[PDB]
Design a protein around this ligand. Structure first.
Ligand SMILES: *Cc1c(COP(=O)(O)O)cnc(C)c1O
Ligand SMILES: *Cc1c(COP(=O)(O)O)cnc(C)c1O
Lengths: 363, 356
C-alpha cells in the first residue's frame, strides 16, 4: 500500500531563511526553500509522509543510491500569478513519469495522486517563496532513491522519497528570446535502444558533464545528441528537439523525434504537440529527423525554426550547429522566431493564470 | 594538488562492534568494519584524509551524487594468510581504474599511491576483521561522489571520497542472453566503474530469474557479441575455427569493463604458453557453431567477488545451449583457481601482492 496525504505530519522551521527578494538574481537550483517533503519505505511498507525543515539527509555509507545509482528525479514548475495564486503545470504527467522511472529501477510504487497532494501541501507551506516577477517560478524537485545498506546489486528493501523546492529566475531575463549553438559530434552517445534514456534517472546525466565541457571549449552552449549510423537528432542538452519546416512533400509541418526509446517523453514536448494539434494550422508529426535531412532542408531553404523544449527553458531557439567541423546556420531568429514566440506567449498565459486551463493545478 | 597520507588524521573507535564468525555465513557486502576513510574536496583543494569510526554520511539533499549520479566506485580484495599477514590483490590497477572513472565524471584528481597508502593504513587499523578461513577475504570498497548543493548539471565544486570494508565469504551458473537488454554502448561509459551502469541492471537480473536463469549474458551489436556476464568479464576456452586451442575474451573497445581478474587470467595464461591467449570479439553465431561441432571446453566469468565462475547453460532466442564446462573438468577453471589462491594467500610469493 501507498503513503496517504491524510497521514501527513507537519514540522515547521524554527529558523526561517532570508528570502532573496525582487531584483536579486536567482541562479537555477542554488537557492532552497524552508521546508522539504520526506517519506521513508522499508519492509513493512511506506511510513507517514512528513513536511520537515530543510535539512541534510543521513545515509548509511553503503546506501545503494550512492553505489549503484538507484536514483530518479522529476522536475516541474509552480507559477505565481499577479494576484498571488500559485499553480502547478500538468503535474499529473510528472507523477506518471516518476512512477515509470520507479518501476524501471525496482524502487517502490506509490499512489500518484497522494504524492501530488503531498507536494501541493509542501508548496502551500512555502508559498511565499514562489516569486512573481516576469518569467520566474518555483522549481519542484521530487526524488526517489534506493537506501539499502548493502553492496549487493539488487532490489532495495529500503527507500527514501524526498521533495525540495527552488525559486528560479527567468530563463530569458528581460523578455527577449536568445538562441543556443550546438555541438553535433557522433562520438558522444546519450542513450541506446534497449537502454534507459527514456527515463529520468540520475545515471543518464553524470556522463554528460564532460561532453558539455567539450561543447563549451568548441564555442557551443549545448550538445546535440546524435544516434545511429544515420545520425538521428534526439535531444538538445536536456531538452527535446523540434524542427519547424516545409517537408520534402511540400507540406508545412512541426516535427519531433518519436518515443522509440532514446527520447525522454517531456511534459513540455507533449504540451507543444497538443497545442499545435489544437490550432490545426499545420501538420504535427512524430518522426525521425536525421542530419542529412536537416542539411538538405537547410540548403533548400525549407527550415524555418529549430528549438528545444523543457521545464527550465520552456522553448529554446537554436541558430547554429557545429557538425563535421562546419558551421550550419539555422535561420530561427530571422524567422521571428514566430512559432517559438507564439508557444512562449500561450504557455505564459496558461501558466500565470491569464487563461483558464485544465492543465493548471491550483495550490 | 592531492591529499597526502602523511597528513592522515587518526580517530580510533571507542565502543567497537561485534565481529562475525562461521556461526552465521554472511551475505556479500552486508557486514561492515569498525572504521572508514573519509576525504573531502572543495574548489580550493583536498582536505585532510581521515580514518574515523564507521558512521553515516551527512549530505545536502541537492547533492549531485543523488540527482545526476556523480558517483563511482571500486572493488578489490585483501587476503589473510596462515601467518596472519594481510595482502591486497593488484591494487595499483584498481587505483588506475578509479582515477580514469573520476576524469570521466569530471570529479577531482588524486594521487593514486597516496590513496593506496591511506587504504593500507585503514586495513591495518581494521586488520582483525580480515578472515583467514578458506575462500574468505576482506572486500574493499572505495567510492568518490560529487557533492555540490546545486541542481545544475555541471562539474562539482565539492566532492567526497570514502572507503568502507566488508568481510566476505565450484557451482556453475545459467545465463539469459536476450538482445533486448543493452548494458553499454560504444561511445558510452560501460568501460568505467560508475554507479550509473548498475542500477538499470536490477530489473534485467529479475527478468533472468523469472526465465529460470541465474545471471545475465550481456549482448551487444547486430551480430550479438558476448560482452559481460552479470558484473563479470567473459572467457571462452575452445578450439577456434582455425583449429587452434585458445582462450579468448572480448577486447577493450568501450563496452567492456577492464577487470583486474580479467587482466590477471590473461597474464597467467600467457606466461604458461600452452595455448593461444587473445582479446577478440566473440559472437553468438561463433559460439553456436562451436557448440554443435563440440569445440567448446569451458566458458566462465571473472571478477573480484566470484573470482572464476563456471557457466553450464545459456538461454538464447528461446533455445537452451548446454555449455560442457563441468564435463571438461573444469580443467582450466580449477587451474586458475589453484594458482590465484596460491598467490592470494601467500603460499607462493608474488609481485602482484601488496603487503598491508
Ligand atoms: C527533463 C528532460 C526533458 C524535458 O522534459 P520536460 O518534462 O519537458 O521538462 C527532455 N529531455 C531530457 C533528456 C530531459 O532530461
Ligand atoms: C567489477 C566488474 C568486472 C570485473 O572487474 P574486477 O576488477 O576483475 O573485479 C567486470 N565487469 C563489470 C561490468 C564489472 O562491474
Amino acid at each position: 500500500s501507498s503513503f496517504k496525504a491524510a497521514d501527513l505530519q507537519l514540522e515547521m522551521t524554527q529558523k526561517p531563511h532570508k528570502k532573496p527578494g525582487p531584483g536579486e538574481p536567482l541562479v537555477f537550483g542554488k537557492t532552497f526553500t524552508d521546508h522539504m517533503l520526506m517519506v521513508e519505505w522499508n519492509d513493512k511498507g511506506w511510513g507517514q509522509p512528513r513536511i520537515q525543515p530543510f535539512q541534510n539527509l543521513t545515509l548509511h555509507p553503503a546506501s545503494s543510491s550512492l553505489h549503484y545509482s538507484l536514483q530518479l528525479f522529476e522536475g516541474m514548475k509552480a507559477f505565481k500569478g499577479k494576484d498571488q495564486q500559485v499553480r502547478l503545470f500538468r503535474p499529473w504527467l510528472n507523477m506518471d513519469r516518476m512512477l515509470r522511472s520507479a518501476m524501471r529501477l525496482c524502487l517502490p510504487s506509490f499512489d500518484k495522486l497522494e504524492l501530488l497532494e503531498c507536494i501541493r501541501r509542501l508548496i502551500e507551506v512555502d508559498k511565499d517563496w514562489v516569486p512573481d516577477a516576469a518569467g520566474t517560478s518555483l522549481y519542484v524537485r521530487p526524488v526517489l532513491i534506493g537506501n539499502e545498506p548493502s553492496l549487493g546489486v539488487s532490489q532495495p528493501r529500503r527507500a527514501l522519497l524526498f521533495v525540495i523546492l527552488c525559486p528560479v529566475g527567468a530563463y530569458f531575463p528581460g523578455g527577449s528570446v536568445t538562441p543556443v549553438s550546438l555541438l553535433a559530434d557522433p562520438a558522444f552517445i546519450r542513450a541506446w535502444v534497449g537502454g534507459v534514456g527514456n527515463y529520468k534517472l540520475g545515471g543518464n546525466y553524470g556522463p554528460t558533464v564532460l561532453v558539455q565541457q567539450e561543447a563549451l571549449k568548441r564555442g557551443c552552449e549545448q550538445v546535440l545528441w546524435l544516434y545511429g549510423p544515420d545520425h538521428q537528432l534526439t535531444e538538445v542538452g536536456t531538452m527535446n528537439i523540434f524542427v519547424y519546416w516545409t517537408h520534402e512533400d511540400g507540406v508545412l509541418e512541426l516535427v519531433t523525434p518519436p518515443l522509440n526509446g532514446v527520447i525522454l517523453p517531456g511534459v513540455v514536448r507533449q504540451s507543444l504537440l497538443d497545442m499545435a494539434q489544437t490550432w490545426g494550422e499545420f501538420r504535427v508529426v512524430e518522426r525521425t529527423i536525421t542530419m542529412k535531412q536537416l542539411l538538405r532542408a537547410l540548403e533548400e531553404g525549407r527550415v524555418r525554426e529549430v528549438f528545444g523544449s523543457g521545464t527550465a527553458a520552456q522553448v529554446c531557439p537554436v541558430h547554429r550547429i557545429l557538425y563535421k567541423d562546419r558551421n550550419l546556420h539555422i535561420p530561427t531568429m530571422e524567422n521571428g522566431p514566430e512559432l517559438i514566440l507564439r508557444f512562449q506567449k500561450e504557455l505564459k498565459e496558461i501558466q500565470y493564470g491569464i487563461r483558464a486551463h485544465e492543465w493548471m493545478f491550483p495550490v
